[PDB]
Structure formats: C-alpha cells, structure tokens
CSV table of N, CA and C in Angstrom, one decimal:
chain,number,residue,atom,x,y,z
A,1,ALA,N,0.8,-1.2,0.0
A,1,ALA,CA,0.0,0.0,0.0
A,1,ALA,C,0.9,1.3,0.0
A,2,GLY,N,2.1,1.2,0.6
A,2,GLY,CA,2.9,2.3,0.6
A,2,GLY,C,4.4,2.0,0.2
A,3,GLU,N,5.3,2.9,0.3
A,3,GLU,CA,6.7,2.7,-0.1
A,3,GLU,C,7.3,1.8,1.0
A,4,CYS,N,7.0,2.0,2.2
A,4,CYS,CA,7.6,1.2,3.3
A,4,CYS,C,6.6,0.8,4.4
A,5,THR,N,7.1,0.0,5.3
A,5,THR,CA,6.2,-0.5,6.4
A,5,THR,C,6.8,-0.1,7.7
A,6,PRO,N,6.0,0.5,8.6
A,6,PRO,CA,6.5,1.0,9.9
A,6,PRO,C,7.0,-0.1,10.8
A,7,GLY,N,8.1,-0.6,10.4
A,7,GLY,CA,8.7,-1.7,11.2
A,7,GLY,C,10.1,-2.0,10.7
A,8,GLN,N,10.6,-1.3,9.6
A,8,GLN,CA,11.9,-1.7,9.1
A,8,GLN,C,12.9,-0.6,9.4
A,9,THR,N,14.0,-0.9,10.0
A,9,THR,CA,15.1,0.0,10.3
A,9,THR,C,16.2,-0.2,9.3
A,10,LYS,N,16.9,0.9,8.8
A,10,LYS,CA,18.0,0.8,7.9
A,10,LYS,C,19.2,1.5,8.5
A,11,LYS,N,20.4,0.9,8.1
A,11,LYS,CA,21.7,1.5,8.6
A,11,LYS,C,22.3,2.4,7.5
A,12,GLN,N,22.2,3.7,7.7
A,12,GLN,CA,22.8,4.7,6.8
A,12,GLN,C,24.0,5.3,7.5
A,13,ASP,N,25.2,5.1,7.0
A,13,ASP,CA,26.4,5.6,7.5
A,13,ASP,C,26.7,4.9,8.8
A,14,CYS,N,26.5,5.5,10.0
A,14,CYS,CA,26.8,4.9,11.3
A,14,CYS,C,25.5,4.9,12.1
A,15,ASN,N,24.6,5.8,11.8
A,15,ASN,CA,23.3,6.0,12.4
A,15,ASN,C,22.3,5.0,11.9
A,16,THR,N,21.2,5.0,12.6
A,16,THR,CA,20.1,4.1,12.3
A,16,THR,C,18.8,4.9,11.9
A,17,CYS,N,18.0,4.4,11.0
A,17,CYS,CA,16.8,5.0,10.5
A,17,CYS,C,15.7,4.0,10.6
A,18,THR,N,14.4,4.5,10.7
A,18,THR,CA,13.3,3.6,10.7
A,18,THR,C,12.3,3.9,9.6
A,19,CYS,N,11.5,3.0,9.1
A,19,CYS,CA,10.5,3.4,8.2
A,19,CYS,C,9.4,4.0,9.0
A,20,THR,N,8.7,5.0,8.4
A,20,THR,CA,7.6,5.6,9.2
A,20,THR,C,6.3,5.0,8.7
A,21,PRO,N,5.3,5.0,9.6
A,21,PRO,CA,3.9,4.5,9.3
A,21,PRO,C,3.2,5.4,8.4
A,22,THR,N,3.9,5.9,7.3
A,22,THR,CA,3.3,6.8,6.4
A,22,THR,C,3.8,6.6,5.0
A,23,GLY,N,4.9,5.9,4.9
A,23,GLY,CA,5.5,5.7,3.6
A,23,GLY,C,6.8,6.5,3.3
A,24,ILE,N,7.3,7.2,4.4
A,24,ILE,CA,8.5,7.9,4.2
A,24,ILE,C,9.6,7.4,5.0
A,25,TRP,N,10.6,7.0,4.3
A,25,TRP,CA,11.8,6.3,4.9
A,25,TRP,C,12.7,7.4,5.3
A,26,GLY,N,12.9,7.6,6.7
A,26,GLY,CA,13.8,8.7,7.2
A,26,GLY,C,14.9,8.2,8.1
A,27,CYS,N,16.0,9.1,8.2
A,27,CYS,CA,17.1,8.9,9.0
A,27,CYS,C,17.6,10.1,9.8
A,28,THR,N,18.7,9.9,10.6
A,28,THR,CA,19.3,11.0,11.4
A,28,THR,C,20.7,11.3,10.9
A,29,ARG,N,21.4,12.3,11.5
A,29,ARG,CA,22.7,12.6,11.0
A,29,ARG,C,23.8,12.6,12.1
A,30,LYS,N,23.5,13.2,13.2
A,30,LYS,CA,24.5,13.3,14.3
A,30,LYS,C,24.6,12.0,15.1
A,31,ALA,N,25.7,11.8,15.7
A,31,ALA,CA,26.1,10.6,16.5
A,31,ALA,C,27.4,9.9,16.0
A,32,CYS,N,27.5,8.6,16.5
A,32,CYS,CA,28.7,7.8,16.1
A,32,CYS,C,30.0,8.6,16.1
A,33,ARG,N,30.6,8.9,14.9
A,33,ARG,CA,31.8,9.6,14.8
A,33,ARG,C,32.1,10.6,15.9
A,34,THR,N,33.4,10.5,16.3
A,34,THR,CA,33.9,11.4,17.4
A,34,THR,C,33.1,11.2,18.7
A,35,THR,N,31.9,11.7,18.7
A,35,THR,CA,31.0,11.7,19.8
A,35,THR,C,29.6,12.2,19.5
C-alpha cells in the first residue's frame, strides 16, 4: 500500500533510521563519529 512498512530500520552511515507508518523512509545525522 505504501513505499515502506513502519517496522523496518535501515543502517545509513553509522546511524540508524526507521520506516515511518506513512511511507517515508527517514534517518538522522548526528552521533557515532567522534562523539
């Protein structure tokens, strides 16, 4: 029904992202590296 399912997490770079219960696959930026 949509692009993604609100239950799948993806590993982009060093951070983690989760599918949203709307069809938009999103991620974060800050974390991992240095601190």
